[PDB]
C-alpha cells in the first residue's frame with residue numbers, strides 16, 4: 442500500500458482515458474507539461490502528459506521523477522508496428538529501448554548509442570512479466586522486444602528502410618520511449634513501455650494513424666490500467 | 676543576476692569549472708552542476724553529457740535547482756558557414772533540430788509538434804556576445820545553429836543538413852534541446868560555441884585535433900560575456 446506508479450503519455454489523446462479514471466485528481470502544471478495525480482482504482486499514480494518527441498519526453502520525465510518520485514515508470518501510447526505479426530490495436534511491450542536516430546559511429550560508438558549511455562536501455566524484468574500476465578488475462582495479441590525511438594514520424598521510404606536495416610529486431614517505433622528510458626536509467630528507476638499499434642510505419646502510416654490513434658490509445662490505456670492493478674496487488 | 680552555463684563534454688566545461696570560486700558541486704541524474712562565482716558573478720555551470728536527451732534532463736535540473744536568469748550554451752561545434760575556421764566563434768540567433776521530421780502531418784521540417792519551428796535566442800545576449808567578439812578581435816558568425824543526435828562527418832548526413840538548412844552556420848548535438856527546455860520555462864538563452872571541425876569527411880580527425888582549441892575559445896568568450904552582462 443505504499444507504491445506510487447508513474448505513467449507517461451506524449452499526446453493528450455494518449456493520456457486522456459487514464460486521466461478520466463483518476464480519483465481525487467489534481468493537476469500539476471510546470472515546464473509546459475501537466476502531471477495528474479490521484480488514484481487509479483485505488484493505487485496512487487502520477488500521470489504525465491509530456492508532449493511530443495525526445496526532448497519533451499526527457500524534460501517531462503525529469504519533472505515527474507523530481508516532483509513525484511514514482512517507484513516505477515510505465516510509458517503508454519501508440520506506436521508504429523514493425524514486427525510482421527502485428528496488427529492495428531495489438532500491444533507492444535519493451536524488452537529494451539534504443540534511439541534509432543543517434544549516430545556517433547565516427548568515434549566507434551555502436552549505432553544508436555550516445556556517448557555516456559549504454560547502447561540500449563533494458564526495461565525492468567518484473568514489469569515486463571506483469572505486463573505479459575495482463576496480456577494473457579485480457580486475451581490480447583502482443584509482441585515483446587526492442588522498441589526504437591526518434592524525433593521522426595515514420596512514414597515509409599528511407600526512414601523505414603533505415604530502421605529495418607539498423608535494427609532488424611525492432612518490433613515497433615515511436616518518439617519518446619527511449620528518452621524516458623534514458624532519464625529513468627540516470628535516476629535508477631525501473632521502466633516498461635506498454636504501447637499499442639496505430640499504424641505500421643509505411644507510406645500510409647499518417648492515414649492509418651489518423652484512423653486508429655484512438656484504438657491504440659484505448660488498447661494501451663486498458664493494458665496500463667490492468668498493469669497498475671496487478672503491480673499494486675498481484 | 677545568476678548566469679546559467681551548460682556544456683556537454685567534461686572538456687567543454689573544465690576550464691570554466693577551474694575558474695569558479697566559492698565552488699560547490701550538485702550531483703544529480705547523472706549530471707553535475709558547479710555553483711559559485713566566475714570573476715565575481717554568480718553562475719551555475721552544468722555538465723550535461725552528450726546529445727539531446729542528456730542536455731534536456733540536465734537543463735531541466737539546472738533551471739529547477741538553480742533558477743538562473745539566463746542560459747549560455749558553451750562548447751565546440753561543426754562549422755557550416757564558409758568564412759569559419761577552426762577556433763572561430765558561432766553565436767546563435769536561433770536553434771532548430773535538423774533531425775526532427777513530422778512533415779507527414781505538415782509541420783515544418785525540423786519542427787516538433789507543440790514547439791515553434793525554431794527557438795529564437797535572446798537579442799540582448801546576442802548583442803553582448805557580439806560586443807565581446809569585437810573587443811577580443813575574434814572572427815565569428817551569427818546565425819542558425821542546428822542540433823541532432825549525430826556527429827556529422829560529411830557524406831549523406833551533411834548533405835541532408837545543407838538541403839534542409841542552407842542557412843545553418845554550425846551543427847552540434849545539444850543547443851536546440853537546451854533552447855526548447857528554456858522555451859518551456861520562459862528563460863532567455865544564447866549559444867556561444869567555437870569551431871572544432873567543419874562536419875565533413877575528416878571532421879573526426881579535426882575534432883581529435885582541435886576540440887581543446889574550441890573548448891578554450893568558447894570558454895574564454897563565455898567568461899567575457901558573463902563579465903559583460905553582469906558588469907557592463
Ligand SMILES: Nc1ncnc2c(CN3C[C@H](CSc4ccc(Cl)cc4)[C@@H](O)C3)c[nH]c12
Pocket residue numbers: 451452492493494518519520521593594595596614615616617639640641642646650777780788
Ligand atoms: N509511425 C510512427 N512513427 C513515430 N511515432 C509513432 C507513434 C507514437 N507517437 C504518436 C505521435 C506521432 S507525431 C504527432 C502527430 C500529430 C500530433 Cl497532433 C502530435 C504528434 C508521437 O508522439 C509519437 C505512432 N506511430 C508512429
Ligand SMILES: Nc1ncnc2c(CN3C[C@H](CSc4ccc(Cl)cc4)[C@@H](O)C3)c[nH]c12
Pocket residue numbers: 545548556683684724725726750751752753825826827828846847848849871872873874878882
Ligand atoms: N561535427 C559535429 N557534429 C555534431 N556535433 C559536433 C560538435 C559539438 N559536440 C561535441 C560532441 C561530439 S560527439 C562526442 C565524441 C566523443 C566524446 Cl568522448 C563525446 C562526444 C557532442 O557533445 C556535440 C563538434 N563537432 C560536431
